[PDB]
Amino acid sequence: MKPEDVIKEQCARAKVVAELWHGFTGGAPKAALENLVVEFNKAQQGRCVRPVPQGGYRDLSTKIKAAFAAGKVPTMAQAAENNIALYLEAKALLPIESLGVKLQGVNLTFLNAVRFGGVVYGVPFNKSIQVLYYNKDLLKKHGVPVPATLEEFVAAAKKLSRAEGGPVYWFQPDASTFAYFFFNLGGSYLKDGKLVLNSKEAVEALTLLQNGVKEGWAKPITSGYINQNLGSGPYAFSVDTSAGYTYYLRAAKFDLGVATLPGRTKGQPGYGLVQGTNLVVFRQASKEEQAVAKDFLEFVLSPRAQAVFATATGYVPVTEGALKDPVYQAYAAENPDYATIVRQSRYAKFEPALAEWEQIRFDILGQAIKEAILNKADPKAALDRAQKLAEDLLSSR
Numbered sequence: 001m002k003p004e005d006v007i008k009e010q011c012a013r014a015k016v017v018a019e020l021w022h023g024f025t026g027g028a029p030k031a032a033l034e035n036l037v038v039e040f041n042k043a044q045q046g047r048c049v050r051p052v053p054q055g056g057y058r059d060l061s062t063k064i065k066a067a068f069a070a071g072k073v074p075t076m077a078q079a080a081e082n083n084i085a086l087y088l089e090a091k092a093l094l095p096i097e098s099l100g101v102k103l104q105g106v107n108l109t110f111l112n113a114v115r116f117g118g119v120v121y122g123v124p125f126n127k128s129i130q131v132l133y134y135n136k137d138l139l140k141k142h143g144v145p146v147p148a149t150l151e152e153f154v155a156a157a158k159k160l161s162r163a164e165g166g167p168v169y170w171f172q173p174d175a176s177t178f179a180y181f182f183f184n185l186g187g188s189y190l191k192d193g194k195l196v197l198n199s200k201e202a203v204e205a206l207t208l209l210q211n212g213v214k215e216g217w218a219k220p221i222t223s224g225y226i227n228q229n230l231g232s233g234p235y236a237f238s239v240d241t242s243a244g245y246t247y248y249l250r251a252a253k254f255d256l257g258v259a260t261l262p263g264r265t266k267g268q269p270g271y272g273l274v275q276g277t278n279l280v281v282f283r284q285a286s287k288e289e290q291a292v293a294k295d296f297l298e299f300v301l302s303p304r305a306q307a308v309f310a311t312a313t314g315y316v317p318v319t320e321g322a323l324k325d326p327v328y329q330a331y332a333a334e335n336p337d338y339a340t341i342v343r344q345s346r347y348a349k350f351e352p353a354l355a356e357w358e359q360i361r362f363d364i365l366g367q368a369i370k371e372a373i374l375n376k377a378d379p380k381a382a383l384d385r386a387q388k389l390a391e392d393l394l395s396s397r
């Protein structure tokens with residue numbers, strides 16, 4: 001009896017049903033969301049949440065845009081900060097504090113990101129941070145400390161790749177992995193208000209990755225997630241979302257390590273990219289649906305819900321109270337990777353919260369990165385093309 005079957009039964013008997021459109025395809029993220037919902041729906045008297053999978057996040061934004069064109073929107077959806085800026089163009093979003101949802105205690109790294117013109121429009125829900133995954137066994141085998149600096153990280157990848165006859169730093173050639181190198185080389189996407197994709201720190205970041213392919217220390221992954229490719233050739237390291245934790249744990253045939261990111265110096269860890277989503281509440285929803293959403297949002301921000309969701313997934317607990325919950329404490333005392341995830345969440349950067357950013361990051365910036373890595377395009381030429389295509393897209397709206 002699958003949690004989604006139990007939810008279908010709950011919603012059938014309910015007097016009111018708030019749909020929640022999401023981008024979890026399966027694994028621990030989809031399961032944790034549904035177990036949370038089952039427990040919520042049990043607690044209510046004929047008022048229920050119905051999670052509806054819409055594919056991935058890009059499929060979810062496409063289906064939400066189509067739902068507006070049809071005039072049939074869900075009560076709630078997942079939304080990254082760029083999707084919030086898009087939905088605010090249509091004044092489609094209910095301010096969260098208008099429902100009476102208390103947000104005291106929500107980590108300000110997460111709450112500042114959902115605040116637009118001083119108004120909170122989203123509840124942080126599944127917020128990830130990039131971490132350093134590694135092969136504890138392969139580092140021990142060659143006497144290599146877990147690198148704390150970018151310099152150390154490059155040296156380790158060179159040493160281990162030479163020892164093992166193959167590139168040990170695995171990466172997707174995408175905007176998320178670029179962001180780690182960009183940010184920690186001192187890059188910023190906004191210069192005096194303007195989006196800039198071809199800055200010298202962008203060129204430096206893409207050049208480092210392309211040189212790591214050429215020098216035989218970096219392995220581009222082109223088919224599936226890094227965790228779906230383990231087993232083929234030697235693996236030492238990747239830089240990847242904390243929501244990958246359970247997928248890495250299931251796939252790895254070696255002893256898996258999680259570390260804080262290599263930074264410019266030992267003074268501080270490297271910044272990680274914040275990914276994952278907020279829950280938003282649509283204005284088009286019925287007052288009765290919005291009251292369900294208010295209850296469900298106060299449930300999701302409860303310390304026990306935050307403790308169960310974060311320990312099941314490797315998402316970052318979004319509240320201070322979650323770290324004080326005994327279920328979280330018992331997990332963390334048995335598994336030091338939860339503390340390492342939280343520690344990394346202190347050193348956290350976001351991508352621009354622009355309405356156009358989904359298209360930009362995938363179809364323009366993502367594409368320039370694949371052109372340089374997979375087709376050996378000059379990094380500067382590839383990013384100059386991305387700059388002009390982004391400038392054309394921004395000016396057209």
Ligand SMILES: Nc1nc2c(ncn2[C@@H]2O[C@H](COP(=O)(O)O[C@H]3[C@@H](O)[C@H](n4ccc(=O)[nH]c4=O)O[C@@H]3CO)[C@H]3CC(O)(O)C[C@H]32)c(=O)[nH]1
Pocket residue numbers: 023024025027029056057058061080081082126128129176225227228241242243244245247275276277357358361
């Ligand atoms: N639409 C839109 N997408 C965005 C934006 N910024 C980033 N992203 C995408 O969000 C994923 C990170 O979100 P996160 O919740 O941290 O992680 C996801 C999955 O990544 C990850 N996962 C799933 C299966 C698996 O084998 N391994 C695994 O790691 O687990 C989670 C549940 O699906 C990136 C990765 C991507 O999905 O492949 C493309 C990128 C944005 O601004 N807009």
Ligand SMILES: [Cl-]
Pocket residue numbers: 230231251252253254
């Ligand atoms: Cl493996």
Ligand SMILES: [Cl-]
Pocket residue numbers: 173174175176361362365366367
């Ligand atoms: Cl990308």
